[PDB]
Amino acid sequence: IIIATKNGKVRGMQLTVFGGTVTAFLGIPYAQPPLGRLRFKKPQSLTKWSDIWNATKYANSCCQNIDQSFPGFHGSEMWNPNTDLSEDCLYLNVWIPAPKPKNATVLIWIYGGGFQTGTSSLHVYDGKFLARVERVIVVSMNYRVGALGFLALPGNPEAPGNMGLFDQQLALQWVQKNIAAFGGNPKSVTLFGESAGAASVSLHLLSPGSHSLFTRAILQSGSFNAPWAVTSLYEARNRTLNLAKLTGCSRENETEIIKCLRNKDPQEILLNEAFVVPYGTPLSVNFGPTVDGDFLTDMPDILLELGQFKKTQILVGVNKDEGTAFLVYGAPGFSKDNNSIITRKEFQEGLKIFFPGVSEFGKESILFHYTDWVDDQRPENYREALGDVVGDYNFICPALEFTKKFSEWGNNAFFYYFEHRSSKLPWPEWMGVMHGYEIEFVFGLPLERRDQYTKAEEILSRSIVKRWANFAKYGNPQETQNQSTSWPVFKSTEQKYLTLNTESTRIMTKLRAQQCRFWTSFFPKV
Numbered sequence: 171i172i173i174a175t176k177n178g179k180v181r182g183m184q185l186t187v188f189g190g191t192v193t194a195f196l197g198i199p200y201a202q203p204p205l206g207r208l209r210f211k212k213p214q215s216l217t218k219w220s221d222i223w224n225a226t227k228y229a230n231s232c233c234q235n236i237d238q239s240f241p242g243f244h245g246s247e248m249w250n251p252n253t254d255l256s257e258d259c260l261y262l263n264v265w266i267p268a269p270k271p272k273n274a275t276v277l278i279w280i281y282g283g284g285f286q287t288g289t290s291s292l293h294v295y296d297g298k299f300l301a302r303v304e305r306v307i308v309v310s311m312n313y314r315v316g317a318l319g320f321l322a323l324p325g326n327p328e329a330p331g332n333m334g335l336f337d338q339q340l341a342l343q344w345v346q347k348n349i350a351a352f353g354g355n356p357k358s359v360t361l362f363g364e365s366a367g368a369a370s371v372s373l374h375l376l377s378p379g380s381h382s383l384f385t386r387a388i389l390q391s392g393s394f395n396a397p398w399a400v401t402s403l404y405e406a407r408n409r410t411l412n413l414a415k416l417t418g419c420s421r422e423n424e425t426e427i428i429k430c431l432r433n434k435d436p437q438e439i440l441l442n443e444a445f446v447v448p449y450g451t452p453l454s455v456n457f458g459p460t461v462d463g464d465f466l467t468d469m470p471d472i473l474l475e476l477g478q479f480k481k482t483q484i485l486v487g488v489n490k491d492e493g494t495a496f497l498v499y500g501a502p503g504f505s506k507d508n509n510s511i512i513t514r515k516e517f518q519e520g521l522k523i524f525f526p527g528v529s530e531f532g533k534e535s536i537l538f539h540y541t542d543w544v545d546d547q548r549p550e551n552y553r554e555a556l557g558d559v560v561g562d563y564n565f566i567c568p569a570l571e572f573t574k575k576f577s578e579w580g581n582n583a584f585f586y587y588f589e590h591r592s593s594k595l596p597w598p599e600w601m602g603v604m605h606g607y608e609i610e611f612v613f614g615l616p617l618e619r620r621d622q623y624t625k626a627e628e629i630l631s632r633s634i635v636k637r638w639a640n641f642a643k644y645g646n647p648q649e650t651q652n653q654s655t656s657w658p659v660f661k662s663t664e665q666k667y668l669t670l671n672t673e674s675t676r677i678m679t680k681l682r683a684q685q686c687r688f689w690t691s692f693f694p695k696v
């Protein structure tokens with residue numbers, strides 16, 4: 171029941187899963203609370219305790235604005251925090267198999283949410299199933315989001331940038347010093363994350379301070395080279411200063427500004443974070459990762475291009491309809507409550523939403539590449555086009571470009587294309603296979619027979635969980651026993667990927683090839 175960690179003893183709880191027993195250590199601190207003077211600074215090493223910490227409830231989530239676009243709707247509220255918001259939020263969770271493992275592979279989860287929001291305590295991140303069914307140890311951590319986690323005055327240690335990334339990294343260090351006490355193999359750690367979490371995992375591949383803290387990496391619908399993923403030192407400053415004006419903290423001494431923002435309450439900082447950008451989109455990362463010179467020593471697209479990353483295996487993939495969810499967060503003519511058939515004029519007005527500071531020619535060039543119809547009278551044409559535009563530009567093509575460039579340095583890479591729509595999905599059907607809705611299959615929620623998934627879904631979760639755990643254990647996401655389709659390596663030439671669905675699991679080649687040539691070779695010029 172009690173584990174001795176290097177900072178003190180922690181007590182866990184017992185959980186019944188699938189006629190077995192999993193041990194959960196929920197809410198173990200991994201750093202001093204970043205309060206007061208420590209607000210905006212890097213996380214600080216935690217002082218020993220001599221009690222027994224009761225890691226028996228999820229700890230506080232980090233301060234964050236909440237999605238209030240669909241109050242009472244489960245499809246949006248299931249992602250909102252489900253513990254108290256607090257600045258005291260640097261805690262982590264450990265799920266160990268019971269009976270205690272001997273030398274188990276560790277899976278470390280990093281949640282997404284645009285670097286502004288998220289919490290490990292979400293129901294779709296519950297690692298008890300993975301512990302039970304695969305005998306891996308699952309770790310997740312809370313890390314600071316928004317300006318409290320990524321406010322940047324570059325060079326200044328009072329607000330150096332990337333604090334939330336350093337939070338994550340301090341958690342990975344925690345696993346290194348402590349997971350062996352829990353039966354875990356620190357030499358066998360896989361990071362996996364989704365969206366901003368997956369872009370975080372991709373940055374830990376780049377950051378030299380993380381290189382000895384994990385073995386392998388899984389990237390779900392997200393990578394650092396996505397257009398929302400990194401903030402420039404320019405914008406980071408303009409946004410750090412805009413926040414200072416919006417709170418009356420404008421000073422001539424940069425360090426005095428920070429001191430001033432420390433005496434503001436978390437809600438005052440949260441309430442002004444949206445306005446630091448003049449034109450925002452539904453994909454607006456107001457305070458995100460930056461090239462700080464510490465966690466990130468150069469611009470990441472240059473490190474990628476020139477082979478400057480941890481050499482190891484990666485499992486990368488995306489969902490079929492990544493971009494549809496964002497259309498009801500602002501695009502004209504759209505609603506989760508009608509079919510959202512839009513017009514050519516409605517489509518064009520929607521590009522101005524998602525590409526605000528882009529030239530008229532750039533927006534015309536998006537329209538041109540995405541409105542050459544297989545049928546001009548199909549009434550869903552513009553509705554589906556804009557979703558693909560958002561999805562290809564923001565997730566699918568950056569994920570493919572990352573895998574391409576990363577594999578070019580001789581490491582095994584595996585790409586998937588998740589194309590199964592959940593049977594219990596509360597969103598409308600024109601939204602398809604939405605951004606974020608593989609996560610429950612990865613965590614094995616369809617395995618519980620008691621929550622109204624179909625049988626075909628339990629099998630698909632079962633296969634995904636096996637492949638995921640075989641990747642973590644053996645760098646190879648195969649399912650070797652049940653005559654499963656073999657998952658080939660992704661190579662720069664042939665570009666083979668695995669489709670994930672409940673019908674046929676197929677080997678295909680060169681995903682969204684025509685669309686990504688536009689986004690990756692042309693559009694970065696405009």
Ligand SMILES: *[C@@H]1O[C@H](CO[C@@H]2O[C@@H](C)[C@@H](O)[C@@H](O)[C@@H]2O)[C@@H](O[C@@H]2O[C@H](CO)[C@@H](O[C@@H]3O[C@H](CO)[C@@H](O)[C@H](O)[C@@H]3O)[C@H](O)[C@H]2NC(C)=O)[C@H](O)[C@H]1NC(C)=O
Pocket residue numbers: 501502503504505507508509510511
């Ligand atoms: C799908 O739904 C959207 C969203 O509208 C909202 O949700 C619907 C399900 C209904 O409950 C609506 O009452 C509700 O507002 C519809 O988009 C909206 O279409 C209306 C059509 O009248 C637009 O209103 C007009 O807009 C112009 C702007 O120039 C004004 O001149 C007019 O006075 C008038 O208000 C409205 O702007 C528009 N809003 C948004 C956010 O898109 C959409 O028509 C609908 N699609 C369907 C039913 O296929």
Ligand SMILES: CC(C)Cn1ncc2cc(Cc3ccc(F)cc3F)c(C(=O)NCCN(C)C)cc21
Pocket residue numbers: 235236237238245246249282283284286287365452453495496499604605606
């Ligand atoms: C609301 C502000 C605090 C931030 N904000 N503003 C616009 C917007 C749009 C999204 C997109 C989205 C929403 C619901 C969903 F079901 C799937 C989705 F893709 C998200 C988001 O991603 N929410 C959680 C889903 N996982 C993947 C992280 C967040 C957004």
Ligand SMILES: *[C@@H]1O[C@H](CO)[C@@H](O[C@@H]2O[C@H](CO)[C@@H](O)[C@H](O)[C@H]2NC(C)=O)[C@H](O)[C@H]1NC(C)=O
Pocket residue numbers: 629632633636649651652
């Ligand atoms: C491979 O297939 C076997 C069946 O041959 C699967 O075993 C099932 O396991 C679940 C959970 O223990 C049981 O409810 C089922 O009844 C079993 N099937 C049978 C036919 O008895 C196994 O899970 C599969 N592995 C995968 C898909 O990774």
Ligand SMILES: *[C@@H]1O[C@H](CO[C@@H]2O[C@@H](C)[C@@H](O)[C@@H](O)[C@@H]2O)[C@@H](O)[C@H](O)[C@H]1NC(C)=O
Pocket residue numbers: 181224
């Ligand atoms: C920490 O936990 C101690 C034991 O918890 C209690 O006893 C065990 C056997 C379980 O039944 C558990 O659910 C009970 O709550 C407490 O006695 C102790 O006070 C706790 N420390 C705190 C609350 O600071």
Ligand SMILES: *[C@@H]1O[C@H](CO[C@@H]2O[C@@H](C)[C@@H](O)[C@@H](O)[C@@H]2O)[C@@H](O)[C@H](O)[C@H]1NC(C)=O
Pocket residue numbers: 272273355357358643
């Ligand atoms: C635990 O195993 C250690 C070796 O780890 C091995 O190599 C890494 C790269 C992983 O892929 C992992 O699966 C392998 O087991 C030993 O050095 C260590 O002594 C072992 N400790 C035990 C058994 O307590």
Ligand SMILES: *[C@@H]1O[C@H](CO[C@@H]2O[C@@H](C)[C@@H](O)[C@@H](O)[C@@H]2O)[C@@H](O)[C@H](O)[C@H]1NC(C)=O
Pocket residue numbers: 408412415416445446447448
């Ligand atoms: C940099 O910031 C400038 C000022 O920001 C805007 O104006 C003031 C009054 C604040 O209310 C702030 O929130 C506003 O958004 C912008 O004018 C300028 O364009 C910015 N440069 C960028 C975004 O590249």
Ligand SMILES: CC(=O)N[C@H]1[C@H]([C@H](O)[C@H](O)CO)O[C@@](O)(C(=O)O)C[C@@H]1O
Pocket residue numbers: 230254255256
């Ligand atoms: C945000 C916060 O600090 N929450 C704390 C809660 C609440 O303050 C109370 O339950 C009243 O809401 O109290 C605890 O003792 C508890 O019971 O877990 C500790 C926990 O950290």
Ligand SMILES: *[C@@H]1O[C@H](CO)[C@@H](O)[C@H](O)[C@H]1NC(C)=O
Pocket residue numbers: 423424425426
């Ligand atoms: C800004 O203030 C700090 C102490 O808060 C000091 O070290 C620094 O020299 C100051 N810079 C000025 C006044 O230009």
